[PDB]
Tab-separated table of C-alpha atoms in Angstrom:
chain	number	residue	atom	x	y	z
P	1	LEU	CA	-13.354	15.025	-21.450
P	2	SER	CA	-10.175	14.603	-19.344
P	3	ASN	CA	-7.450	12.048	-19.750
P	4	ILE	CA	-5.696	10.457	-16.776
P	5	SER	CA	-3.116	13.135	-16.082
P	6	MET	CA	-0.078	10.887	-15.625
P	7	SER	CA	1.476	8.490	-18.165
P	8	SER	CA	1.831	4.752	-17.625
P	9	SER	CA	5.545	5.090	-17.003
P	10	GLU	CA	5.085	8.097	-14.659
P	11	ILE	CA	2.628	6.003	-12.610
P	12	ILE	CA	4.897	2.976	-12.678
P	13	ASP	CA	7.707	5.250	-11.447
P	14	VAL	CA	5.630	6.305	-8.430
P	15	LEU	CA	4.886	2.648	-7.593
P	16	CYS	CA	8.586	1.763	-7.992
P	17	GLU	CA	9.604	4.642	-5.698
P	18	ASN	CA	7.304	3.528	-2.874
P	19	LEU	CA	7.940	-0.224	-3.208
P	20	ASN	CA	10.756	-0.012	-0.664
P	21	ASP	CA	11.235	-3.289	1.223
P	22	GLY	CA	8.165	-4.894	-0.384
P	23	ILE	CA	10.563	-5.920	-3.117
P	24	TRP	CA	11.420	-8.918	-0.891
P	25	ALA	CA	7.890	-10.319	-1.093
P	26	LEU	CA	7.986	-9.846	-4.821
P	27	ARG	CA	11.331	-11.704	-5.188
P	28	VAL	CA	10.031	-14.585	-3.077
P	29	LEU	CA	6.731	-14.957	-4.949
P	30	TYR	CA	8.458	-14.526	-8.321
P	31	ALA	CA	11.084	-17.237	-7.547
P	32	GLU	CA	9.021	-19.644	-5.445
P	33	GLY	CA	5.565	-19.143	-6.939
P	34	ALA	CA	2.283	-18.693	-5.065
P	35	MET	CA	2.473	-19.187	-1.346
P	36	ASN	CA	0.517	-19.110	1.952
P	37	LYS	CA	0.958	-15.718	3.747
P	38	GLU	CA	2.467	-17.565	6.730
P	39	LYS	CA	5.156	-19.206	4.675
P	40	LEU	CA	5.670	-15.971	2.696
P	41	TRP	CA	6.389	-14.302	6.102
P	42	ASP	CA	9.192	-16.846	6.734
P	43	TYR	CA	10.634	-16.735	3.220
P	44	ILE	CA	10.769	-12.940	3.179
P	45	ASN	CA	12.764	-13.053	6.399
P	46	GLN	CA	15.062	-15.755	4.945
P	47	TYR	CA	15.606	-14.050	1.551
P	48	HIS	CA	16.420	-10.727	3.155
P	49	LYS	CA	18.646	-12.371	5.731
P	50	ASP	CA	20.642	-14.282	3.124
P	51	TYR	CA	21.061	-11.235	0.928
P	52	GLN	CA	22.549	-9.318	3.893
P	53	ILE	CA	24.867	-12.277	4.571
P	54	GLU	CA	26.083	-12.271	0.961
P	55	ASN	CA	27.587	-8.836	1.673
P	56	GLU	CA	28.533	-9.225	5.341
P	57	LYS	CA	29.428	-12.791	5.997
P	58	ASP	CA	29.302	-12.142	9.774
P	59	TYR	CA	25.997	-10.292	9.551
P	60	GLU	CA	23.574	-10.932	12.381
P	61	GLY	CA	20.687	-8.481	12.151
P	62	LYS	CA	17.022	-8.402	13.123
P	63	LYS	CA	14.282	-9.910	10.942
P	64	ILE	CA	12.910	-7.449	8.412
P	65	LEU	CA	9.516	-8.833	9.550
P	66	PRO	CA	9.775	-9.274	13.342
P	67	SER	CA	6.030	-9.303	13.941
P	68	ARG	CA	2.744	-10.106	12.301
P	69	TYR	CA	2.111	-6.328	12.566
P	70	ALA	CA	5.169	-5.751	10.295
P	71	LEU	CA	4.050	-8.566	7.939
P	72	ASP	CA	0.580	-7.035	7.670
P	73	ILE	CA	2.048	-3.609	6.922
P	74	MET	CA	4.347	-4.944	4.196
P	75	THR	CA	1.620	-6.908	2.444
P	76	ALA	CA	-0.798	-3.955	2.915
P	77	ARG	CA	1.579	-1.700	0.934
P	78	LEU	CA	1.844	-4.353	-1.867
P	79	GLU	CA	-1.875	-5.036	-1.905
P	80	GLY	CA	-2.732	-1.332	-2.064
P	81	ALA	CA	-0.299	-0.933	-4.962
P	82	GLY	CA	-1.934	-3.923	-6.660
P	83	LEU	CA	1.362	-5.785	-6.953
P	84	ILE	CA	0.344	-8.986	-5.096
P	85	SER	CA	-3.091	-10.490	-4.521
P	86	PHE	CA	-4.435	-13.441	-2.615
P	87	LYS	CA	-7.000	-16.231	-2.791
P	88	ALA	CA	-8.632	-17.845	0.235
P	89	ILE	CA	-8.490	-21.466	1.353
P	90	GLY	CA	-10.704	-21.171	4.387
P	91	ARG	CA	-8.826	-18.867	6.754
P	92	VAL	CA	-5.561	-19.313	4.822
P	93	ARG	CA	-4.468	-16.668	2.306
P	94	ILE	CA	-2.476	-17.772	-0.753
P	95	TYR	CA	-0.542	-14.887	-2.302
P	96	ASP	CA	1.008	-14.397	-5.749
P	97	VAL	CA	2.382	-11.551	-7.887
P	98	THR	CA	-0.164	-9.831	-10.161
P	99	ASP	CA	0.227	-8.653	-13.750
P	100	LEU	CA	1.096	-5.124	-12.558
P	101	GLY	CA	3.486	-6.671	-10.046
P	102	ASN	CA	5.200	-8.500	-12.915
P	103	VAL	CA	5.054	-5.355	-15.072
P	104	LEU	CA	6.911	-3.779	-12.195
P	105	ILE	CA	9.490	-6.444	-11.486
P	106	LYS	CA	10.692	-6.073	-15.096
P	107	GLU	CA	10.653	-2.291	-15.052
P	108	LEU	CA	12.785	-2.602	-11.907
P	109	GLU	CA	15.745	-4.765	-12.965
P	110	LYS	CA	16.048	-3.099	-16.372
P	111	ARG	CA	16.358	0.271	-14.645
F	1	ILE	CA	4.474	-5.352	-19.306
F	2	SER	CA	2.200	-3.239	-21.548
F	3	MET	CA	-0.233	-1.714	-19.123
F	4	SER	CA	-2.014	1.547	-19.974
F	5	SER	CA	-2.508	4.418	-17.546
F	6	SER	CA	-6.135	3.377	-17.439
F	7	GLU	CA	-5.359	-0.279	-16.676
F	8	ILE	CA	-3.026	0.685	-13.874
F	9	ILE	CA	-5.465	3.198	-12.374
F	10	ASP	CA	-8.211	0.543	-12.473
F	11	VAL	CA	-5.998	-1.699	-10.374
F	12	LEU	CA	-5.280	1.084	-7.885
F	13	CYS	CA	-8.974	1.924	-7.657
F	14	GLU	CA	-9.948	-1.672	-7.040
F	15	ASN	CA	-7.553	-1.907	-4.096
F	16	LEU	CA	-8.247	1.530	-2.508
F	17	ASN	CA	-11.349	0.559	-0.481
F	18	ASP	CA	-11.684	2.573	2.717
F	19	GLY	CA	-8.496	4.544	2.049
F	20	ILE	CA	-10.606	7.010	0.100
F	21	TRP	CA	-11.356	8.722	3.422
F	22	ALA	CA	-7.725	9.730	3.914
F	23	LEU	CA	-7.555	11.171	0.387
F	24	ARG	CA	-10.731	13.183	1.020
F	25	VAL	CA	-9.461	14.463	4.359
F	26	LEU	CA	-6.075	15.482	2.996
F	27	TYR	CA	-7.536	17.112	-0.090
F	28	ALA	CA	-10.049	19.155	1.981
F	29	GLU	CA	-8.011	20.033	5.057
F	30	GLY	CA	-4.531	20.205	3.595
F	31	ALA	CA	-1.334	18.649	4.894
F	32	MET	CA	-1.375	17.533	8.533
F	33	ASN	CA	0.477	15.249	10.940
F	34	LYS	CA	-0.458	11.578	11.235
F	35	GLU	CA	-2.266	11.849	14.581
F	36	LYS	CA	-4.595	14.531	13.255
F	37	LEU	CA	-5.193	12.514	10.046
F	38	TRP	CA	-6.274	9.593	12.228
F	39	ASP	CA	-8.795	11.829	14.101
F	40	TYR	CA	-10.030	13.472	10.891
F	41	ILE	CA	-10.494	10.209	9.048
F	42	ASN	CA	-12.607	8.961	11.912
F	43	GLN	CA	-14.463	12.285	12.140
F	44	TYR	CA	-15.124	12.420	8.389
F	45	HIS	CA	-16.319	8.828	8.160
F	46	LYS	CA	-18.361	9.216	11.354
F	47	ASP	CA	-20.246	12.215	9.949
F	48	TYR	CA	-20.829	10.534	6.622
F	49	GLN	CA	-22.286	7.602	8.573
F	50	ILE	CA	-24.228	9.631	11.113
F	51	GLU	CA	-26.365	10.847	8.257
F	52	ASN	CA	-26.566	7.459	6.546
F	57	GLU	CA	-23.880	3.626	13.683
F	58	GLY	CA	-21.004	4.270	16.064
F	59	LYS	CA	-17.864	2.270	15.198
F	60	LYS	CA	-14.670	4.165	14.280
F	61	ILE	CA	-13.324	3.318	10.831
F	62	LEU	CA	-9.853	3.403	12.467
F	63	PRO	CA	-10.257	1.944	15.998
F	64	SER	CA	-6.546	1.517	16.739
F	65	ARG	CA	-3.167	2.716	15.619
F	66	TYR	CA	-2.873	-0.664	13.853
F	67	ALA	CA	-5.853	0.111	11.626
F	68	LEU	CA	-4.389	3.556	10.994
F	69	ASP	CA	-1.013	2.124	9.949
F	70	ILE	CA	-2.560	-0.552	7.701
F	71	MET	CA	-4.691	2.036	5.924
F	72	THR	CA	-1.886	4.509	5.455
F	73	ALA	CA	0.470	1.671	4.396
F	74	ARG	CA	-1.877	0.622	1.553
F	75	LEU	CA	-2.077	4.297	0.497
F	76	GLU	CA	1.639	4.974	0.715
F	77	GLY	CA	2.422	1.839	-1.286
F	78	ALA	CA	0.010	2.850	-3.986
F	79	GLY	CA	1.703	6.235	-3.947
F	80	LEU	CA	-1.558	8.065	-3.157
F	81	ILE	CA	-0.387	9.930	-0.024
F	82	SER	CA	3.136	11.055	0.815
F	83	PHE	CA	4.759	12.300	4.007
F	84	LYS	CA	7.702	14.283	5.378
F	85	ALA	CA	9.286	12.934	8.552
F	86	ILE	CA	10.206	15.539	11.154
F	87	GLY	CA	11.722	13.742	14.100
F	88	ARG	CA	9.148	11.068	14.840
F	89	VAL	CA	6.381	13.265	13.519
F	90	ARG	CA	5.049	12.790	9.986
F	91	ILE	CA	3.203	15.377	7.902
F	92	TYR	CA	1.007	13.756	5.229
F	93	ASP	CA	-0.656	15.091	2.113
F	94	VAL	CA	-2.364	13.591	-0.942
F	95	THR	CA	-0.222	13.241	-4.081
F	96	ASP	CA	-0.648	13.754	-7.793
F	97	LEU	CA	-1.517	10.057	-8.181
F	98	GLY	CA	-3.790	10.325	-5.137
F	99	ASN	CA	-5.655	13.162	-6.896
F	100	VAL	CA	-5.811	11.056	-10.100
F	101	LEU	CA	-7.731	8.479	-8.052
F	102	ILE	CA	-9.964	11.143	-6.425
F	103	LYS	CA	-10.815	12.301	-9.975
F	104	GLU	CA	-11.265	8.776	-11.300
F	105	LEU	CA	-13.681	7.935	-8.475
F	106	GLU	CA	-15.687	11.083	-9.067
F	107	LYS	CA	-15.840	10.057	-12.720
F	108	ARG	CA	-17.288	6.702	-11.636
F	109	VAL	CA	-19.802	8.282	-9.274
F	110	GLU	CA	-20.866	10.271	-12.266
F	111	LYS	CA	-21.347	7.215	-14.490
F	112	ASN	CA	-22.989	5.007	-11.881
F	113	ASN	CA	-25.657	7.554	-10.990
């Protein structure tokens, strides 16, 4: 009766445009593999920090994730977009990139 | 790669959860600032519940920011910053999900 009114690439473009800083969680998970949310918090801060230092060797800025509140917001954006997902180990959450998240990492670099 | 519009939308639908309330509010009431959205989301959900209680779906600003974050990331709502104020509205993709959910309500009933 009615097709989905936006193409796969138009939808992917919207997800790419709102990814913003979440790209750091994707880079971490893509390079390091699945990880505990707590460790992902640390790695995202380290990846971002090192990337800033690559450009400004005397860089000394604030953590992109200074609080659990910030961590929860960043993962919330990625979970809502279906780019990362998690599995439970008791109260621990193990995160990894999803198929759409991978579909998106490619679509990113290329463009 | 190789994901159809349908496959992608399925993924967005599976992760929407309670965010549907914000899409419904924005669609019905039109664009509004974030503080009003918070009130309306609670008011909308409250009413739905009242006739189906007590607890606010968004009891704190934290809950409000987590819910809107999931929606913004999925590209379902969008906002314009004016100073520290933000005016939100539901997007084309947000309406695609509203329509997709109504299609499912239709099939599941």
